[PDB]
Amino acid sequence: PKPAICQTATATLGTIGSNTTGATEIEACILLNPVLVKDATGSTQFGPVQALGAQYSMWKLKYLNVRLTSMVGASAVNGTVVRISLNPTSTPSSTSWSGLGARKHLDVTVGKNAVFKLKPSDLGGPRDGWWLTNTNDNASDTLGPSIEIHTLGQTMSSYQNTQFTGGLFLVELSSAWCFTGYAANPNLVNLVKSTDKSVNVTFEGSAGTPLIMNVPEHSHFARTAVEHSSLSTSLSRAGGESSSDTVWQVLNTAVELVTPPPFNWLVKGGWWFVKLIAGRARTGARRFYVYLSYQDALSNKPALCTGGVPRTTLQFTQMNQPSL
């Protein structure tokens, strides 16, 4: 399949903040699916990309350059390493830093400038190179790759050796999306992408039962999910509560949440998928099933806890518009 059309785009995606744990922290997670990039200030060039993604059925990338620009000199700060990596299926990983080293990646030391260049062979989809555009399909064929940025090592003011607060790098992305095949339904889609600057989250679960995320009822995120979550639903499991067919990806860059086992790795990884639970509800907050992957969410297979349970800035993306 040769492309019908190829569209280049360039965007500024925000800053990589400094490290306070000393351990691995996630600082960005960038979906490349053409209907999932967000058109906002700094990214207006993604408007056409979304439009094409809604009108064609197959996409691929010609290339992908991610540029890191130092916002702070090496005379000033010390101690932190930044790792840019390619997540090929956009599926959360439990392997932390050493796993990131297995993927195609670039490390840059604080106070330095760099460009992570990717060849088409690194990005290709399973349909003779292509991915599918419609995010209601089987996920292994739709979502395609993601760029993740992680930091390792406490960021210290190089003079007083105290904790440094502030941005280390500016992220700029440049790529070109190719499209072919005609959307059976264009969908015109307008998927919500927003941020909830501060909100309090809790987790409940029990042995054999689904991990649940609670969000206060009048938070911006709880608000937006209830407005935009499809009224069509499904039933998990048994007895077993109904959940919207609309999925949301959640990414937490606020530095520390605890969960029922075995899912400490997931919340520390910083991003997962959720579906809104049907409730009254009550008691207090809105409630969300948590999912280990997009296909798990599409298939109504939530994360199942091994036991009971022993502050955040959320960035969220509507993955989904059910009807299909």
Numbering used by the authors: 77 to 331, 335 to 389, 399 to 412
Manuscript excerpt for this entry:
To further enhance our understanding of astrovirus assembly and maturation, here we report the crystal structure of VP9071–415 from HAstV-8 at a 2.15-Å resolution. The S domain has the typical jelly-roll β-barrel fold with eight antiparallel β-strands that is broadly conserved among many viral capsid proteins. The P1 domain is connected to the S domain through an asparagine-rich linker loop (i.e., residues 257 to 267). An intramolecular disulfide bond is formed between C82 and C254. A Dali search indicated that VP9071–415 is a close structural homolog of the HEV CP in spite of the lack of any detectable sequence similarity.
HAstV is a nonenveloped virus with a T=3 capsid and a positive-sense RNA genome. Maturation of HAstV requires proteolytic processing of the astrovirus CP both inside and outside the host cell, resulting in the removal of the C-terminal domain and the breakdown of the rest of the CP into three predominant protein species with molecular masses of ∼34, 27/29, and 25/26 kDa, respectively.
